[PDB]
Ligand binder design. Structure first.
Ligand SMILES: CCN(CC)CCNS(=O)(=O)Cc1ccc(C(F)(F)F)cc1
Ligand SMILES: CCN(CC)CCNS(=O)(=O)Cc1ccc(C(F)(F)F)cc1
Ligand SMILES: *[C@@H]1O[C@H](CO)[C@@H](O)[C@H](O)[C@H]1NC(C)=O
Ligand SMILES: *[C@@H]1O[C@H](CO)[C@@H](O)[C@H](O)[C@H]1NC(C)=O
Lengths: 536, 532
């Protein structure tokens, strides 16, 4: 080894690693990027459960981010920062089952609580190596050990012919579980506490956290959970066995593959791009906020539908943090609903609102669509282009995030879980999306991870204090199961979400303000009445 | 012999009586016959014009109230007795009353005709809350009220028969309107400025004169207080009227002609005994014998006619009170009473919705319960009590009033809409019932001006304000004082801005949208639901 930094060499079960000494604004951090945790799921292993990574010889260099899992790449606004910030930033490859580890430098003295990040992106996209997921600040400022993994997305992650051995589905979720098993065995070599491990994720990542809560094998790999703008329940996170099967055989036919063994075998002989190129063509209706290849209700990972499982499972000794941004829906309108764009004020007509309701609520019958249209329209001003636009954003945001989270928060709480609920209401001063989109899906994240602390990034001073505050909320919750400061008593307190009072806090530049009722009236509509109306 | 009290009408001569109102005398002519007594074989039949009479007919006393069911639930309680008959019950009841300033107007004076309510099942014009002296003495109006047949006697129909063709109760009102046309000028009334105004079933009847072309030549303005021709309770189909007619006939021991004959040969109370037993469901705010869609008086359904008529030369004043439904809960809904606070459970609230909305399917009462629950306090006894009253009030008055106002304003009419929010200081109902169905009436008729009625000074001032709105409406079509130059004016209800005003002790305040989101639920979505 000779003349290396002796704080950057670490042994794990698979072999030796050499990490990197990164500069964060307020000190150095240790990072170990690109650690292989499964065998490359390539060739005859495509669509299959990850096998644990065979040990390697010598010191593995762990100083670069590894390849992004093969995925669709957004082409709507080329060069626009607001979309590129989510696109992959390393080479696309099916060999992509790697994870990353940030820790204080030097590595800590006492065993430190671990935070595991699961990125979002609709189960069709995402990478643990994007800039908004950079753990250098949570490590340096809060002392935390942060772990983020790559997991297979798209067809490679979730294409299922249920019941079969060569494509049993949910293998993307099995990637994440394997990374969690990896943390249990290895994170103490870095100073992490394998007995204090908190999952947290956004969008499909938040959804995934939910599925590890509900899948009994994952339950012994973590102890607390944070779900940001996403849920295992709801209309997009899961599909029936039947629908997954229909979506898989359609894609097979679309690439020329017509007994499931012979069909998957053919799929395994196709370039990764040919699958990506046809992935969006298997959706049943014209939709937004719908993704072709997502977790399946397999009767295995998910013993039953998430709706059934949250309704009837025991959840004491489980601490959860859940929340939403203010305008969950706005982002999705520009990827489908005619009339909407990032370059226009998107002032739409009544006609277009009704057309958009059928796209944002694609599974809805004619009557249920009318019901949605009746609820959201302002009958004092039923033709105002501005109320209609913002109403269209709210249909999509309520139906896909806010009311599922409301359903999850109330059903967990009724079943003994300590729940904490927020709404994130601050719009980044640096946002490049138009004002009409408000605080869109995903723009909490740069503040949880603490990017405002980077002087070069041009956030306001208050934005930097704000980001520090939510970093302490998230980390306090990872440490204690309670986002509140023990020492800071004078500060306004964050109370648990109860079925009786339904308290939640607002996250913005002002101090915490407590509110009652997660869009209670409107989510009674989506969570109670609407199921009974398509039940007839 | 006071010549002011001698009037010659087309049917002979009358003597009225001079009454004291607080600020002066009034000429009243009570008990004037306008039709042949619909007794014996003329039962269920259209009314016939009264034959002329000899000598000078005495019209100083109130004539009998039409035969009707009498309420029993709170015996001798002022809140209920005040609506109960205050003269003898008779089928010989087709008489009307005229009040006129003393001395009689020197110029043709606008006429106000009052059509009482009582669910098409009860009511009379001799009730003290319809006392016409105040409006005649203070605003100088000529005020007319008539009796019309109620219950089986007014509205039992075997449609398309000739012995019981339906709606004779409305043909009673119609004939009174024609009597006013032929005769009112003799009292100083202006037959060319006649405003109908009524409440509950009366407001509904006023609506049916708007929609029945033969009635249009007998009035020029209308006021519909807390009642409409559209909606769930004011009409039945011919199929359904025939059902209850033949059901009542089965129940009292009785081909159409023979069936209606037997019914004629039956003491009155024998028919009223079974009046309530022909409703198809357990109900509240539902009545056994109401106007029928006959293809005659009502060419189509009221919902179809408002959706399609031409109303350009029409001016209308429509409104509701704060707590329409609350009155009806004590009359059928388990858990509710005038004598406790009627705090109810969630299950009791589910059960009440199937009676407040008796026609609704499982899915539709589900929909109603989910809408009216306060999902922040879904089990709170007080929110459920207040929501049950709102369900009943919105389903039956507020939302029909909002649908009629919308259709009228859109199709050429001039609409002025109110919400009456003041609770009488003398009210004898419990505090939780708010301002119930029917308790604006005492203030429009000016009763607080009677000092022995122990109303508060501001309530006297408030009643005089309302009397001006109504009489100004009669003279002009516009309830706004043409002298008051002060800013808050009552604006016309429009489809675009949906403005209405609030009537209470504080000055007029203008609000937009008359329970807009909730009536979109009732008028737009719920129809789509049941019919699927
Ligand atoms: C804003 C942060 N999120 C969550 C991490 C990432 C963006 N993907 S998204 O959320 O799921 C919204 C979206 C849907 C469909 C398309 C495409 F590619 F089909 F056009 C792009 C983006
Ligand atoms: C307060 C103003 N109104 C009309 C002027 C008086 C009561 N009739 S009402 O509105 O229709 C309410 C009511 C319904 C049914 C019953 C009974 F008798 F059948 F039980 C009594 C009272
Ligand atoms: C905004 O732009 C989109 C796409 O170019 C277009 O379809 C829409 O109609 C425009 N709307 C307005 C209000 O300019
Ligand atoms: C931040 O602001 C400086 C000017 O002070 C500018 O030169 C730089 O390019 C900006 N960077 C970003 C990422 O906006």
């Amino acid at each position: 080894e000779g003349r290396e930094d002796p704080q950057l060499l670490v042994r794990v079960r698979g072999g030796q690693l050499r990490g990197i000494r990164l500069k964060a604004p307020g000190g150095p951090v240790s990072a170990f990027l690109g650690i292989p945790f499964a065998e490359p799921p390539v060739g005859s292993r495509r669509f299959m459960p990850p096998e644990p990574k065979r040990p390697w010889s010598g010191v593995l260099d762990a100083t670069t981010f590894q390849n992004v899992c093969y995925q669709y790449v957004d082409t709507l606004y080329p060069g626009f920062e607001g979309t590129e910030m989510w696109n992959p930033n390393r080479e696309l490859s099916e060999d992509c089952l790697y994870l990353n580890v940030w820790t204080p430098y030097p590595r800590p003295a006492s065993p430190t609580p671990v935070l595991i990040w699961i990125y979002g992106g609709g189960f069709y996209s995402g990478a643990a190596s994007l800039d908004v997921y950079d753990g250098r600040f949570l490590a340096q400022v809060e002392g935390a050990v942060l772990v983020s993994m790559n997991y297979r997305v798209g067809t490679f992650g979730f294409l299922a012919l249920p019941g079969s051995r060569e494509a049993p589905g949910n293998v993307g979720l099995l990637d994440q579980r394997l990374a969690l098993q990896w943390v249990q065995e290895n994170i103490a070599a870095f100073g992490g506490d394998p007995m204090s491990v908190t999952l947290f994720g956004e969008s499909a990542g938040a959804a995934s956290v939910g599925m590890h809560i509900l899948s009994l094998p994952s339950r012994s790999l973590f102890h607390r959970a944070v779900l940001q703008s996403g849920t295992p329940n709801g209309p997009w996170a899961t599909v029936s066995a039947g629908e997954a099967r229909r979506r898989a055989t359609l894609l097979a036919r679309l690439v020329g593959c017509p007994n499931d063994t012979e069909l998957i075998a053919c799929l395994r002989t196709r370039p990764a791009q040919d699958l990506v190129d046809h992935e969006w063509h298997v959706l049943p209706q014209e939709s937004i906020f719908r993704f072709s290849f997502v977790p399946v209700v397999d009767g295995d990972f998910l013993s039953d539908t998430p709706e059934a499982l949250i309704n009837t499972g025991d959840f004491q000794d489980l601490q959860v943090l859940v929340g939403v941004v203010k305008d969950e829906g706005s982002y999705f309108l520009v990827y489908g609903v005619p009339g909407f764009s990032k370059d226009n004020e998107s002032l739409i007509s009544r006609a277009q609102f009704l057309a958009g309701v059928r796209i944002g609520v694609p599974q809805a019958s004619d009557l249920a669509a009318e019901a949605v249209v009746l609820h959201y329209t302002d009958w004092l001003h039923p033709e105002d282009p501005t109320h209609l636009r913002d109403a269209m954003s709210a249909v999509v945001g309520d139906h896909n995030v806010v009311c599922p989270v409301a359903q999850l928060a109330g059903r967990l709480a009724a079943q003994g879980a300590r729940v904490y609920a927020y709404i994130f209401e601050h719009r980044a001063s640096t946002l490049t999306w138009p004002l009409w989109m408000g605080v869109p899906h995903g723009y909490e994240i740069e503040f949880i991870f603490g990017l405002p602390l980077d002087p070069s990034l041009n956030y306001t001073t208050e934005e930097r204090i704000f980001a520090q505050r939510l970093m302490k909320y998230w980390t306090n919750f990872a440490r204690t199961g309670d986002p509140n400061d023990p020492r800071d008593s004078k500060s306004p307190q964050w109370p648990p979400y109860t079925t009786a009072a339904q308290q939640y806090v607002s996250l913005n530049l002002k101090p915490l303000e407590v509110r009652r009722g997660l869009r209670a009236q409107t989510c009674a509509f989506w969570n109670r009445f609407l199921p009974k109306l398509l039940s007839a």
